[PDB]
Fold this protein.
Amino acid sequence: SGAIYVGNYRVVNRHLATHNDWANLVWEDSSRDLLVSSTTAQGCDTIARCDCQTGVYYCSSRRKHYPVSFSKPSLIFVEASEYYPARYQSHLMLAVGHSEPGDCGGILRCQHGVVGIVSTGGNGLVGFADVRDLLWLDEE
Ligand SMILES: O=C1CN(C(=O)COc2ccccc2)CCN1
Ligand SMILES: O=C1CN(C(=O)COc2ccccc2)CCN1
Ligand SMILES: [Zn+2]
């Protein structure tokens, strides 16, 4: 689990969004596994605006932050998981590391702020749903 809190937005994995998320929907994209809902209180996170390929992510199934190198956001085939069929996921970044289903929502961050959230796992990789192209998260 986990979310990004930027201004009056909550960014979560689409597959973990609550009824309250969907009832307060700003934007959602199944292909990216992302959903954004509205908040009352302002959030503590800043979104990275950059093309960094190195950063640190939080892994709940290890209670640890890991430094990783990761691929640029691309359209990637993902093997079936507990929460999705085998399918193509877009805007996805891969790194070598540990990721289980419960790790979804862990933040990947760089020097410029939050890059993305954990979205995929298995076969010794961790995948992150990028948010750095969502410039609209920074206003309104
Ligand atoms: O037992 C299972 C079966 N799996 C699946 O059902 C894959 O599809 C989905 C589809 C919809 C919702 C959640 C998961 C993955 C591996 N474990
Ligand atoms: O303390 C941390 C962890 N962080 C997170 O991403 C928390 O996310 C997860 C994912 C699943 C459940 C609970 C937490 C922020 C930076 N360091
Ligand atoms: Zn960066």
